[PDB]
Amino acid sequence: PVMEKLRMFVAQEPVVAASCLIGGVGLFLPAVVRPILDSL
Amino acid sequence: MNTDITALEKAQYPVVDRNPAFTKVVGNFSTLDYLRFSTITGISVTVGYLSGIKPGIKGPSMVTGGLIGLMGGFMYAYQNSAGRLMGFFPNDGEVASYQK
Amino acid sequence: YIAVPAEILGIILPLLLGVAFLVLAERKVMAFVQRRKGPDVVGSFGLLQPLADGLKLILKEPISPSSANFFLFRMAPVATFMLSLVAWAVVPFDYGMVLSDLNIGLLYLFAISSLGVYGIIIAGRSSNSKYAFLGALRSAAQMVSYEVSIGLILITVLICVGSCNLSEIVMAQKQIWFGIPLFPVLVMFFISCLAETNRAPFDLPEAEAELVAGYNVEYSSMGFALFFLGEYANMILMSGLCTLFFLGGWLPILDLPIFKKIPGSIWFSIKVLFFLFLYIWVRAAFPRYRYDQLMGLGWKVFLPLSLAWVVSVSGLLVTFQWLP
Amino acid sequence: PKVSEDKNRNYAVVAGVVAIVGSIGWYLKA
Amino acid sequence: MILSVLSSLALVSGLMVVRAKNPVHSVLFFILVFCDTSGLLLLLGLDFFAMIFLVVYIGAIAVLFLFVVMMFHIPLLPTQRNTTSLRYTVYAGKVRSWTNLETLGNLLYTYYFVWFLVSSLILLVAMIGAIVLTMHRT
Amino acid sequence: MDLIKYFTFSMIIFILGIWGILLNRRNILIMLMSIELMLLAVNLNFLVFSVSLDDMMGQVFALLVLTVAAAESAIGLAIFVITFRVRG
Amino acid sequence: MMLEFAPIFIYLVISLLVSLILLGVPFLFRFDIRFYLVSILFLIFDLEVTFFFPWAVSLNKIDLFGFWSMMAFLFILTIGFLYEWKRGALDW
Amino acid sequence: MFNLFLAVFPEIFIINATFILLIHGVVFSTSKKYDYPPLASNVGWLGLLSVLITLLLLAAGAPLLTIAHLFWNNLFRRDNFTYFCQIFLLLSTAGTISMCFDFFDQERFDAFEFIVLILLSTCGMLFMISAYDLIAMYLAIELQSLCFYVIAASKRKSEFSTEAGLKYLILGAFSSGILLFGCSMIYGSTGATHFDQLAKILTGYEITGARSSGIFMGILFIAVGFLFKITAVPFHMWAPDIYEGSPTPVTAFLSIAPKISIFANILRVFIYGSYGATLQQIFFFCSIASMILGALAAMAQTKVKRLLAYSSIGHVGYICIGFSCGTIEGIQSLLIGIFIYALMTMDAFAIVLALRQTRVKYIADLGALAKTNPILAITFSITMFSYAGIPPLAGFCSKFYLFFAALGCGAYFLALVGVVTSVIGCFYYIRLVKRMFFDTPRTWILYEPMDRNKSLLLAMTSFFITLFLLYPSPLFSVTHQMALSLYL
Ligand SMILES: CCCCC/C=C/C/C=C/C/C=C/C/C=C/CCCC(=O)O[C@H](COC(=O)CCCCCCCCCCCCCCCCC)COP(=O)(O)O[C@H]1[C@H](O)[C@H](O)[C@@H](O)[C@H](O)[C@H]1O
Numbered sequence A: 001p002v003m004e005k006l007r008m009f010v011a012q013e014p015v016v017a018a019s020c021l022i023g024g025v026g027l028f029l030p031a032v033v034r035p036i037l038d039s040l
Numbered sequence B: 001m002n003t004d005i006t007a008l009e010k011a012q013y014p015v016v017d018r019n020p021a022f023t024k025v026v027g028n029f030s031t032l033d034y035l036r037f038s039t040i041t042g043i044s045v046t047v048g049y050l051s052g053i054k055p056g057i058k059g060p061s062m063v064t065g066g067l068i069g070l071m072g073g074f075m076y077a078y079q080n081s082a083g084r085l086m087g088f089f090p091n092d093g094e095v096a097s098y099q100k
Numbered sequence C: 001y002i003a004v005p006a007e008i009l010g011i012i013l014p015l016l017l018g019v020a021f022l023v024l025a026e027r028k029v030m031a032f033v034q035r036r037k038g039p040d041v042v043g044s045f046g047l048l049q050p051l052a053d054g055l056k057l058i059l060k061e062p063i064s065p066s067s068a069n070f071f072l073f074r075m076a077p078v079a080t081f082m083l084s085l086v087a088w089a090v091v092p093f094d095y096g097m098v099l100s101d102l103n104i105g106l107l108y109l110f111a112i113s114s115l116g117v118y119g120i121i122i123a124g125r126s127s128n129s130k131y132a133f134l135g136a137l138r139s140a141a142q143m144v145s146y147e148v149s150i151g152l153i154l155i156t157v158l159i160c161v162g163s164c165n166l167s168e169i170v171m172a173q174k175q176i177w178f179g180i181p182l183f184p185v186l187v188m189f190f191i192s193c194l195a196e197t198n199r200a201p202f203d204l205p206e207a208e209a210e211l212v213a214g215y216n217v218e219y220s221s222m223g224f225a226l227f228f229l230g231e232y233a234n235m236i237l238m239s240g241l242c243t244l245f246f247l248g249g250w251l252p253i254l255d256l257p258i259f260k261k262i263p264g265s266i267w268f269s270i271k272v273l274f275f276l277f278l279y280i281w282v283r284a285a286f287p288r289y290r291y292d293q294l295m296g297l298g299w300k301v302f303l304p305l306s307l308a309w310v311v312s313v314s315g316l317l318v319t320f321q322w323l324p
Numbered sequence D: 001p002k003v004s005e006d007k008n009r010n011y012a013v014v015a016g017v018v019a020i021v022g023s024i025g026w027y028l029k030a
Numbered sequence E: 001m002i003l004s005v006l007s008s009l010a011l012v013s014g015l016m017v018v019r020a021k022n023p024v025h026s027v028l029f030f031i032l033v034f035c036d037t038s039g040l041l042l043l044l045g046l047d048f049f050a051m052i053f054l055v056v057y058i059g060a061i062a063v064l065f066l067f068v069v070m071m072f073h074i075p076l077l078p079t080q081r082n083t084t085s086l087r088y089t090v091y092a093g094k095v096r097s098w099t100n101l102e103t104l105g106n107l108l109y110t111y112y113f114v115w116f117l118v119s120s121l122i123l124l125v126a127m128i129g130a131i132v133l134t135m136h137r138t
Numbered sequence F: 001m002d003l004i005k006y007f008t009f010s011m012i013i014f015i016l017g018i019w020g021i022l023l024n025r026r027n028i029l030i031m032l033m034s035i036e037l038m039l040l041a042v043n044l045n046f047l048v049f050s051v052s053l054d055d056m057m058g059q060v061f062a063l064l065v066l067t068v069a070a071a072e073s074a075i076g077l078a079i080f081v082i083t084f085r086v087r088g
Numbered sequence G: 001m002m003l004e005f006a007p008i009f010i011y012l013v014i015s016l017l018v019s020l021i022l023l024g025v026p027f028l029f030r031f032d033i034r035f036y037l038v039s040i041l042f043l044i045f046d047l048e049v050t051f052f053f054p055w056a057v058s059l060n061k062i063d064l065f066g067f068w069s070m071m072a073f074l075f076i077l078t079i080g081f082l083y084e085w086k087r088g089a090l091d092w
Numbered sequence H: 001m002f003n004l005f006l007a008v009f010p011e012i013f014i015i016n017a018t019f020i021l022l023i024h025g026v027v028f029s030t031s032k033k034y035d036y037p038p039l040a041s042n043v044g045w046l047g048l049l050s051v052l053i054t055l056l057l058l059a060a061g062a063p064l065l066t067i068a069h070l071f072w073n074n075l076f077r078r079d080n081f082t083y084f085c086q087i088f089l090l091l092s093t094a095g096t097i098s099m100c101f102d103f104f105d106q107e108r109f110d111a112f113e114f115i116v117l118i119l120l121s122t123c124g125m126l127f128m129i130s131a132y133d134l135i136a137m138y139l140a141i142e143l144q145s146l147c148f149y150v151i152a153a154s155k156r157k158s159e160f161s162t163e164a165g166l167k168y169l170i171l172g173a174f175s176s177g178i179l180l181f182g183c184s185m186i187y188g189s190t191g192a193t194h195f196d197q198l199a200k201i202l203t204g205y206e207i208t209g210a211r212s213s214g215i216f217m218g219i220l221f222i223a224v225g226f227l228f229k230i231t232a233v234p235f236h237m238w239a240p241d242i243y244e245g246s247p248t249p250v251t252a253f254l255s256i257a258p259k260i261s262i263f264a265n266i267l268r269v270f271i272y273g274s275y276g277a278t279l280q281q282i283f284f285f286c287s288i289a290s291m292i293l294g295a296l297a298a299m300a301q302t303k304v305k306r307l308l309a310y311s312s313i314g315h316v317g318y319i320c321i322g323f324s325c326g327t328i329e330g331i332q333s334l335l336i337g338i339f340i341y342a343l344m345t346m347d348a349f350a351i352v353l354a355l356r357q358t359r360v361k362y363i364a365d366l367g368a369l370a371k372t373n374p375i376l377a378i379t380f381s382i383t384m385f386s387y388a389g390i391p392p393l394a395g396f397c398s399k400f401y402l403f404f405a406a407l408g409c410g411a412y413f414l415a416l417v418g419v420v421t422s423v424i425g426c427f428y429y430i431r432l433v434k435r436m437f438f439d440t441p442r443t444w445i446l447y448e449p450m451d452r453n454k455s456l457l458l459a460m461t462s463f464f465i466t467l468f469l470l471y472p473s474p475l476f477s478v479t480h481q482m483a484l485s486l487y488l
């Protein structure tokens, strides 16, 4: 599965994984959370 | 934003849902749309495999071709479905589906 | 309209004496960290030591052949010093304690900081040496590289406040400092300001420039000292930028309406000197950092991460409609 | 001598078969 | 009179750029041309562009050129007796008056957003081209 | 009369850049500075016209021109350093 | 609204005078490509900052459209920087 | 919201595929598992597939691509003319990228950035045809300009490639500055950067009744910049050197893909932004000079690429004949000439790439080619005759209808100069013929056989050229519809 390769990548590159995680959060909030709170 | 979707050349055919939502036109895919999607994706995957044997990257080339074909076929199917709902295409099916 | 030069001198002269006493503070704090006393004999607590240093530097023969076109070598200190001073014309000390009231005043700071690269470059080139020029060029490349991280962090700050004006940035921090939420961003900005002034573990470029050469170039007696003065003025400026943006610029830190006797002009100075103490602490707590890994670090752990922080702040503010 | 054992080339073959079938259906259904 | 002397000095620097004796001084005068130009824009009333000229032209382009050079070696007549008092100021519109930055960003990313992406593609072309040509990596 | 002065100054910068690029066929470095001068003069033309007409299409396009100027300079110096590697 | 730059000009003149009086006191008594590459990356990632500056200030006026256009711009430059990273040209 | 982007799918898809190809190439060109594979042909085949898919997207969206025309009005305006122009430019790009595959492995040039830059410049060209404003016009020009500046100097071992790339860079930068200075004053004297409102403020009053020194000279500078862009005499400072120095696949992409888009751009500017009838004069003299000097200069060249460069300049003059006579028939002749010249240029560069396998340099190396490979000799002779304008071939029809358009407007001097330049032009073409059929040199150069894609493209183009006069109705009808779609 992809989990082993993903975890090995996170272990070797901490800064890139952290940057991707924060960027994914910052892109997921306005693309998913925003429409569902727009409709209350 | 202020958005107005009005074509310069109006639809020659009956119009249903002049501004169709993404989910519905995705759900309007007929067997022809699925067939053209599948053939585009298959052609792209085959080209990706065949081209990437000389460099030796036989699987990654397959995946890249598959991504390209999936995107292209989905765009083509969506365009056809939309033009059917917008009325630019023959759309003889969902015009009957609208009545019932 | 004749009142301006008085303000200019009142901003310049205390800056120079503060640079001198900041050198003294550097020596004294490094002494105390290493279980020492530092300059104590001169003056009372070493307070007259910078004065003795200055009078000693003046009372020496100047080595000024300059072995060159006689012009570019004497203009580099002037350029770096005038830039490091003009960067101080926009700082909003307390409320009206600001010289110029630029409606942007932040892209202006970014531009002034970016322009402070030619001084060292033309100093290295004018100084006819096959390694001093190269070392100056590496230092310039380092500052240039960390400028982009500085700019991205400035954008991160500017998103929250919504206006470029420096006074309004502090005005927007009545609720919280912007340092509590953006603490990783504050650390990044501190490290970038630390690495952009060659005043850090991020120091090796110039460190080897003297080790392999000994500065066997046209070393003016105290004409060279203008580089040192400008570097320490930049130290003070980039120490104050952190307390303008991430800490409250002049607002009380954690205060009930009881300690209102003191003014806001010293709430700024206490944070500035705290950040200066942190500068000295970091210098005398860590080993130097190689230039091979300096560039790689500055390009691969700060640009993507600061860009991600920009993206996350913008996305979170937009989602909940929390914009200014 | 019963299985191809190349799980990567098999996907290419099935994709090509799907492409041919889709092209034929496109020609006929349309 | 501030415009005249600044324009004249910019013109002199631009003239000396093309007839320079060595590339170093050519780049040095090239920097002064943009310095004067930014001052002129500042006089014009556009503070944002006046400082982008420092950030880009003499912030990155001039540094790049210097790095490369280091190595590899009908008008209205001036009569204004009765015109400085005929200025009609419409106070409406002064309330909630935007700057040169808010106005630009209002319509740069929203209405004319295709050209913005075209400029992004231009930047990507430059970034790729600077690498394909110059990667020796020996 | 200041629009006239602005336009004349920009036009003289433009013709001076043309002058610089035309004369020296071999410098290859003054040519790039002259091209930058031409772009600068046109940017000032656009900004001055935008201010005079109170129209915003001048400043948007002037800002977009900077991307082209930077990209052209970057590619120019890339090709220059490639060319210089051959000789000397 | 823009008279606040004449103080900057006078400050600059006085600072130059102070520098002159400071320098005059004693008187009264070979090629690397990597440098070019880092300069190019700085230029490219400085243009993006100059583009960010109008976006952040006017981000309130524009909702879910300017933000996503700037995100597309960032994605394009991120693809560029990713090609930059893997190819090399980013470490020494 | 999302359906407002149905008019930009043929471009969004090509951008996304370009990004995917760039990512795949950069990821798998540095993998130690596969030992740094040479994935230039792989990326090229994927790019050709992407071009075919976006061509399919563009072709099937004829009823579409005109929706939300108010929302996109400020940015671009695409119509029947733009639709056909894009659908032909993309086909030309596909053919060029297809006939250069063997160039990647024959001489071991595995740089996949070449293909991604071809794709991205093609996207820029697709922007240019749809561009309906001065800003978008200039930006779309600059996309392809920078892509070509990068690509021309790609082969960094030959002094020709680097110097030609630098000359192209300097000339294009000067031309772009000239064009942008021209647009700046047209904006200054009228505002109204948009083409729709630029064609309405200038139609009100003729230039003869009152003289505006700003609009006229801005239009003149725009025309001068555009003539620099297409390398039209006297603005041909270095074009033969650019075409000789640049790599053969690059020159194959040039002079077909850029010229089509720039000519569509010039059509859009000329029809709308020009009502003073002052561009007739600038096109007249420059096209005459291009005709005369191309005809008189291509006869003195001994290499092949220089001859193709000067033939391209001559055909540019022949096409520019259509601008001087502004009528429906003039634009029809211009577009038909562009189409035929594009096909013949593709065929000729396929010939040149075929003999590039053994490094053909001069015109004498292709001596006695009728013996080693008779059929390729016949194909090259037919293509050369089509260039000449011999009746029983394509290329004669284009010159014919260009002459008809020239005589329709009463420009009798244009017809005479066209005839005489054709007479001299055919002479050195037949001179090329003699050395390739009749006289046999002592030493023979042997050429290794070709590959299937180039051979198939060459056969298709050769059958198109010969049998065009049998059934030319579809091209004429397309061109008549395109010429009228500029207004309705
Ligand atoms: C009296 C006679 C009447 C008439 C009788 C009628 C009979 C009907 C016969 C139809 C034959 C179909 C022919 C279609 C042919 C397509 C081209 C063949 C494609 C092909 O190379 O094969 C597979 C690949 O796979 C696909 O890339 C994509 C796969 C495409 C091919 C899959 C076709 C499978 C269809 C199965 C239908 C079963 C029909 C059963 C018929 C028998 C019933 C009794 C093997 O690749 P590979 O890596 O080992 O090796 C390839 C190959 O060597 C060359 O292409 C290259 O030189 C080399 O670089 C490498 O690429």
Ligand SMILES: CCCCCCCCCCCCCCCCCC(=O)O[C@@H](COC(=O)CCCCCCCCCCCCCCC)COP(=O)(O)OCC[N+](C)(C)C
Pocket: B045, B057, B058, B059, B060, B061, B062, B063, B064, B066, B067, B070, D007, D008, D011, H019, H020, H023, H024
């Ligand atoms: C989702 C948004 C887009 C995300 C991608 C955008 C960026 C573009 C990146 C494109 C390049 C990615 C290519 C790498 C992807 C992973 C590669 C891979 O899966 O291959 C693996 C394994 O892959 C496989 O085995 C099977 C994968 C292909 C089968 C599926 C084909 C694709 C079908 C359609 C695509 C998916 C659907 C569309 C997307 C949902 C490696 O196998 P090999 O090493 O070649 O096998 C051994 C080789 N050797 C014998 C020499 C030792």
